[PDB]
Amino acid sequence: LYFSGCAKAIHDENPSMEGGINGKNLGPINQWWLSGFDGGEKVLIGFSTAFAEYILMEPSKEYEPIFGLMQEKIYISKIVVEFLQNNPDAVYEDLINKIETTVPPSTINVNRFTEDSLLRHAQFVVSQVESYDEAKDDDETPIFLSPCMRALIHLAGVSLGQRRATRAPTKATTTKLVYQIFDTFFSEQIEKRRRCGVCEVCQQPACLKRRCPNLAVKEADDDEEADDEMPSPKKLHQGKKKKQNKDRISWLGQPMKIERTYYQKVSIDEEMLEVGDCVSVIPDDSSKPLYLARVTALWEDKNGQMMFHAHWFCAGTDTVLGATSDPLELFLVGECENMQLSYIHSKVKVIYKAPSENWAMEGGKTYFFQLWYNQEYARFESPPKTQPTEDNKHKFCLSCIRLAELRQKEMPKVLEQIEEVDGRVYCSSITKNGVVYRLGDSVYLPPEAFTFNIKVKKDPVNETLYPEHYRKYSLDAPEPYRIGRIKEIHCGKKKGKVNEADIKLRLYKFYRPENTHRSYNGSYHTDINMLYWSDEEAVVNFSDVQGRCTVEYGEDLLESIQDYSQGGPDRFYFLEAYNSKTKNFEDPPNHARSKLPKLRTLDVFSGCGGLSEGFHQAGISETLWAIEMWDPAAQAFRLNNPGTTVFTEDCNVLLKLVMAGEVTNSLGQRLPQKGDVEMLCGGPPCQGFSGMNRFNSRTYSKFKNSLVVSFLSYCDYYRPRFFLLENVRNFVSYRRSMVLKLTLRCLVRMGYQCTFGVLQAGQYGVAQTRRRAIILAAAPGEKLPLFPEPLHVFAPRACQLSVVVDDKKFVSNITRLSSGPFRTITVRDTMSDLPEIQNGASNSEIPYNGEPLSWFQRQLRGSHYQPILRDHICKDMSPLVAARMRHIPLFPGSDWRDLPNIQVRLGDGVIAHKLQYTFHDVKNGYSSTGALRGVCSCAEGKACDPESRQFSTLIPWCLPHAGNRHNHWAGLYGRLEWDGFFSTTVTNPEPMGKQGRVLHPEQHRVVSVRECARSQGFPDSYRFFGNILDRHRQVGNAVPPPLAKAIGLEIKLCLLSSARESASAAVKA
Amino acid sequence: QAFRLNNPGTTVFTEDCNVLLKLVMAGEVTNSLGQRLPQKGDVEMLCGG
C-alpha cells in the first residue's frame, strides 16, 4: 500500500497543507503503529517505511471517510484500554456500561457507542488491548485477561495473537498477631506448557514475549473453576502401633477403684506416670507421625496385663488447618481407645493455653492445645470443661463421655407408656434426636412415607423464519415434608421389655393445598404455612420422622394467624378439612382442636445493609457502626438505619486511627473502641487472588495485604463475642483452599472457636440460586453456632454444599439434604404482583395498582397498606436489544434461539436486517429447507473471514458464530420462567451477559431494580440510593436478608443458651 | 483531578488536611492509597488559601 499527502515539520501543529512539501506513492507501507494509550488523548497513528516514519495528522477530503471508520475503531479501543487500566477485574457488564455511557467527541461522526459496536469491532479492540500489554511492561496481569475481555473474546469469535502497535503497594492495617501469621507463612511454604502453536505469537522465535494468549486465556478461565461425591474422611489413629520393651513396669500406690478390672492413679515405667499426664506412642512407621495422647485411666484386666486408656490428641497439621498450623499446637478429638501400657514410648508435656481473664481486651517450646476439633464438621470449639465426679474420677475420658451423650441423644427411647395390646405397647410420649414426641404433636416425614388420593408430540418449524431453533436441543426440587398429627404410638416388644427399634406411629394426614385436587393452583396465593386436615390415616416408623412441628387450628387461636406464624419455627395452620373423595372443603372435626440481647454490631463492607438487615430481623443485633467506601451504598444504608454511624473511609485507615487512641474521625463521628463491638460482620472482597491454582509470589502479595487480612485484624483488635465472614462459595477453594485455611488459622491463633460452611440462599426462601461461603466464629465463653437447616426444598443441583480440602470432604451440620418443610419460592411468588412497565422505565415512585398475590409478596409489603412502589425502574436498552426482547417468545425456556430472522424498523431511521447464512456448517448440517447454517468461514473449518461478520442483526451474528463451542449460548436473551428462579444475584442485567436469564417472563424488557430486590428478599420498604445502576449494584451485592435472618436465628440460640447457663450457674452461686 | 493534569509530578492528596497531618504526626510514611507523605525537610515552601 502506498500513500501521499503533505509532509510537515515534526513540531508543526498546523493540519493545513501550509508549511509542507507534497509527496506521492510514498514507499510501500512496512508497518503501521499507534501510541497515546497512557497519558492524554494523544492517540497518534503512525506509518512506517523503509525510508522513514510518519505521524498522521488529518486525512485528505477523499480519504476522510475511509479514515473515518478507522478512527472509531481506535477511539473505542482507547476507552477500553484506559478503562481497564483503572478497572482490572471489571466484568463484561461493566464495559458495556462504560462504552455505552462514554460520550464520544463531535470529532467522531458517531453519536454514541453500543454493545453492537464493540462486537462489530471485537477483533480490532481485543487485538489492540493485547498489544498494549506487550507494549508497556508490568509484572501486573495482562489487561486482555480481565474477565470483561475474556467474556468478549469468547462471545465475539475473536482469535488471539494477531500482533500490531506499541509507541507504593497497598499496606493492610494489621495487628501484631495477625501480621505474624501471614508473614511466617510467606517465610515458609513458598517455592516453584503446551501452547496452541498455531497463533501468530507462537510462530515467532530471555528475548521471549512468545507467551501464547490462547493458552493464557484457557489458563485464566480454568483458574476460575473449582471441584464440587467423595467418601466421608477416614478417622485418624486407627493404624498399628509399636510396643516398647518391658523392663520395670509396676503399679504404685493403692487401687483407685475396682470394676473384673482394677484401676490405679500412678504407674512406674522406669520413671513415673500419673492419670492426667500425656504419653506418646509410635506407630508402624508408614510415615513417622508421632502419636500423642492423654492418659485417661490405668488398670489391670482380669488376665493380668496392664492397660491404659488413651484419649488421643490431633496434630494441627491433621486438622483442616494443615500446613498453616503451629507445629506445637494440638487439638482434642473424639478419638480414644484402650491399649497396653506396653505401647507408650515417652511421657510428654502438654500445656493448656487457656484464655485470659481479659482475653477480650487483649487485642494488640512444648506441645500445647487450645480447642476441641470435630473432624467431620470442621468445628474448632472450647473444651467441654465438665469436671470429674468421684464415681468416675479414675476413668474420666471426655471422648467417651461425648460419644455417650451422642449415643443416647440419637437413641429412640420411650418416656411414658400406657396399655398393651397383642405384642404392641401403646405410649403417650417418646424421644429422638433430643426431641420429645407426645400424642397429638405433629410430625415431619419424607414424601415417600405415605400416600394421598391420586389423579390421571410437536409439529415442524419454519426454519427460514426461525433458523437457529434447531440449536434448542444439541432433576427438579423435591417435595417438602409430609405432615401428620400423631394419634397412636404402639411400639413393639423385644421379649422382656419394649422394642425401642420398632416404634411405630399412626397419624392423621394433613394435605398441603397442592396435594389437594387444586394442586399447582393451591400453591400460588396460599400461605406456604397452611395445611388442610384429613381423617385419612397412616402408619410409619419412628425412624422416618424428620422432626416435630406445630400444626394449630386457625379458630382455636388467641392471636392473628400472621402473628402466630411469625412467632416461631415449624408452625403451620389449618382452617378447613379436606376430603379426598367428596373433594370438598368442610370445617374440621372436634377432635382436631383442643429478654433477647441485641449484640452491638459493626458491619464492615456493609453495602446498602442486607446482612445487617437479616440480623436485625432475627432480633440478635443492632448495627451501630458500618464501614462502606462507596458513597451510594453508604447513603442507602443510612436511610435504612438512622441509628448507625456510617463511615465511608477506608477500613485500613479507621483501624490505624483507633490504634492510636483517636476517639473520632475527620467528620467527627464516633469511632468504636474495644468493648463497644459485640459482633463483627462483613464481606471482604477478594480482589487480586480469587483463583484456585497454587499461591505465587504475585498472588500471595495481594492476599497478604487484602481486605480479608484487614478484616481479621478488626477481629483481633476488637475481639468480638461473635464473628461472620460472608463471601462467594468459591472462597473455600481459592488458592488450593489456603485462603480458608489461613483465615481459620488466624482465628485459632487469636483463640477463637470457629468453623465454616456453604449455604444455598434458595433454601431459605428466596427465588434464586446462590451459594455463599460463611465463616462463623465465637469467642471462648460463647458457644459456636450451627448453620441453619434449609427451610425450603430446592433443586439438588444447586445445593452442592460440601467442601473438599486437601482431598478430604468437609460438610456442615446441616441434615436436611434435599427435602424441608416449605415449598420453593418461585419467580412468580417473587414478582407476579408488580404493575406493568416498559423498557426504560424511570419513575421511581409509582402506585402499586393492585394487592399482593403470593404469600411472599404479602410478607415483603407488610400486613397493612402502603401506597408507593419504589424502584420499579428498569434500564433503557438500545432500540436493537429492545426489538430483540420484543421478539423473544413467552413460552418457558425461550431465548435467542427462538428469535425470527426478520427485518425490523428500529424506532428511528435505523433498520435491523436479516442474518445472511452464507457458509456450510459442517458439524451442524443443513436446515430442513436445505439452507446453509454457517455464518462465518470458520463454520467450514477455515479461518474466519472478517467482514463476513455481520452487525445490527436481530439474531446476533456473534451467537451462531461461536454457538457450537459455547453450548449454543443457551440462556442468552432468555426469559426468567415464572416457575423458576434467578440464575444468580443480578447486579447489572445484560441479555448477553454472564448473570443469567434476565428478561422478564412476559414483558419485553429486562428485570427492574425492585424485581431484583424481591429476588433478594428485601422488604419493599427497604430503600436504595443514586442512579439506576448504582441501585442495581446495591441490591445484587447484598446478602439476602432471609439468609441473614436464618444465620441470625442460629446466633439467637447460642445467646439464649449461653444466657440461661450463666443463670443456672448464678443459682449454684 | 485538574491540578494533576497540569502537574504530573505532584502527589495530589484529596484527603482532609487535618487527617494527613495526624498521619505524619504518627510516623506514617504513606496514606491509604499508598501515596508518598511528606516528612520534615521535604517541604521547603508551604503555600495555601
Ligand SMILES: [Zn+2]
Ligand atoms: Zn498460540
Ligand SMILES: [Zn+2]
Ligand atoms: Zn474414652
Ligand SMILES: [Zn+2]
Ligand atoms: Zn469465524
